[PDB]
UniProtKB/Swiss-Prot annotation:
One Pfam family this sequence matches: Nucleoside_tran
UniProt-annotated location(s): Basolateral cell membrane; Apical cell membrane; Cell membrane
Name of encoding gene: SLC29A1
Residues listed as glycosylation sites in the UniProt record: 42
Tissue: Expressed in testis at the blood-testis barrier (at protein level). Detected in erythrocytes (at protein level). Expressed at relatively high levels in cerebral cortex, particularly the frontal and parietal lobes, and the thalamus and basal ganglia (at protein level). In the midbrain expressed at moderate levels, whereas in the other areas of the brainstem, namely medulla and pons, cerebellum and the hippocampus expressed at lower amounts when compared to the other brain regions (at protein level). Expressed in Langerhans cells and lymphocytes in the pancreas (at protein level).
Result after altering residue 368 to S: Loss of nucleobase transport. No change in nucleobase transport
Protein name per UniProt: Equilibrative nucleoside transporter 1
UniProt-listed InterPro entries: ENT1/ENT2, Eqnu_transpt, MFS_trans_sf
Topological domains annotated Extracellular: 100-107, 169-175, 241-252, 308-322, 382-385
PTM statement from Swiss-Prot or TrEMBL: Glycosylated.
Reported effect, residue 182 to S: Loss of nucleobase transport. No change in nucleobase transport
Annotated control of activity: Transporter activity is sensitive to low concentrations of the inhibitor nitrobenzylmercaptopurine riboside (NBMPR). Inhibited by dilazep. Inhibited by dipyridamole. Inhibited by hypoxanthine. Inhibited by azidothymidine (AZT). Inhibited by dideoxycytidine (ddC). Inhibited by dideoxyinosine (ddI). Inhibited by draflazine. Inhibited by soluflazine. Inhibited by cladribine. Inhibited by capecitabine. Inhibited by clofarabine. Inhibited by ribavirin. Modestly inhibited by acyclovir. Modestly inhibited by 5-fluorouracil.
Reported impact of residue 319 to A: No effect on the transport activity for adenosine
Annotated effect of mutating residue 263 to C/I/V/S: Decrease in the transport capacity but no change in affinity for adenosine. Resistance to dipyridamole and dilazep, little or no effect on the sensitivities to nitrobenzylmercaptopurine riboside (NBMPR), draflazine and soluflazine
Amino acid sequence: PQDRYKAVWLIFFMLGLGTLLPWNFFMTATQYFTNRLDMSQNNSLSAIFNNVMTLCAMLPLLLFTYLNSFLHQRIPQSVRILGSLVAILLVFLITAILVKVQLDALPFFVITMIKIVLINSFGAILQGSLFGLAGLFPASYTAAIMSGQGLAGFFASVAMICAIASGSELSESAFGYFITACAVIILTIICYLGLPRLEFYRYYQQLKLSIKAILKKISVLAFSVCFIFTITIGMFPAVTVEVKSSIAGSSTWERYFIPVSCFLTFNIFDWLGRSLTAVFMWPGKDSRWLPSLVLARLVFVPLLLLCNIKPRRYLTVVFEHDAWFIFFMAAFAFSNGYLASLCMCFGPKKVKPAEAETAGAIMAFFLCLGLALGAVFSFLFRAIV
Ligand SMILES: [C]OC1=[C]C(C(=O)O[C][C][C]N2[C][C][C]N([C][C][C]OC(=O)C3=[C]C(O[C])=C(O[C])C(O[C]C4=[C][C]=C(N([O])=O)[C]=[C]4)=[C]3)[C][C]2)=[C]C(O[C])=C1O[C]
């Protein structure tokens, strides 16, 4: 029970990074997908790309985390993890190739949406299998995955900012995104392959030798994490990206305000929140404070909705100064990452070892369910207003 050189922990960190960095990079290239559609089309495809991507992403993600939650035992973990990684690698490679070939708007749209469905279908399997596997190890090792995911968001924000500041065409920035993701997926595979020869890994993984009952034991953390991401995705990014500066001195702020004050703030403090859990896990797996703080986050809905959103037609700006928005985004993002990591770490520990794997898989589904519910609410809000 001694992780020498913290090798297994570092590999779990890299697994987390490898799970989300590609997808995150994909999301950050939305400007490339919509702009490409605009320069190609001669109700529009770019006007619907975001919403159709949300559907092509959240439906497969939710379906396959569900199926994995009750079918993971039938497929070896090495197959589920390494096959999902190789599939995603192949998809992102193709995504990079399409940047350099000429294609009409509608085929590009359709093919990109197909690739999005695959990314999130194999992603679901890969994410559900990783949290299941981490369910056999101490809680710190689920925090490793969460922390590595947080780093994936931070890197995505650095990449977005650097891309704007470079002055390069959106297509070549996006080609860099996709090639980077391919390299990261290859590094993730290598790291995963190094686990079986580590004694610490075999110690907890040798523990392999009633879904309704398991769900009853983790229901508090499962619904908590679902509510975490319902709130988060209900406000971020679709709603928060519409905030405008009120103290800008220069027109140069315009193209940077959102990627800095919204995306960077979020991914910095969400990453840090997830990272703190590997060393500090208050309030504890049995404390009723964790669901209570998850509930209290509901305050951010009015708070952020009453920030300086422009154009606005129905609500008033109660918090106009950027400092309000950045402060709310930091707290909004820190509570998300910190409480989400706690729920994912503790969930598997509410159950016996021979069920921790399944518990982790279920926790993954509820996380994704949160995401899907968030996407719905934001849409329903925008569809009514
Ligand atoms: C939010 O975000 C973001 C974004 C950005 C941008 O650009 O916008 C654009 C995009 C748009 N959209 C699209 C999509 C949709 N939606 C909703 C949702 C959001 O959410 C998300 O998706 C998530 C989550 C999360 O958790 C964090 C997750 O996990 C749990 C997820 O799953 C998936 C996967 C997994 C795995 C994989 N494998 O493994 O492979 C793959 C894949 C997801 C919305 C919309 C930017 C940024 O920065 C840079 C950010 O941040 C990072």
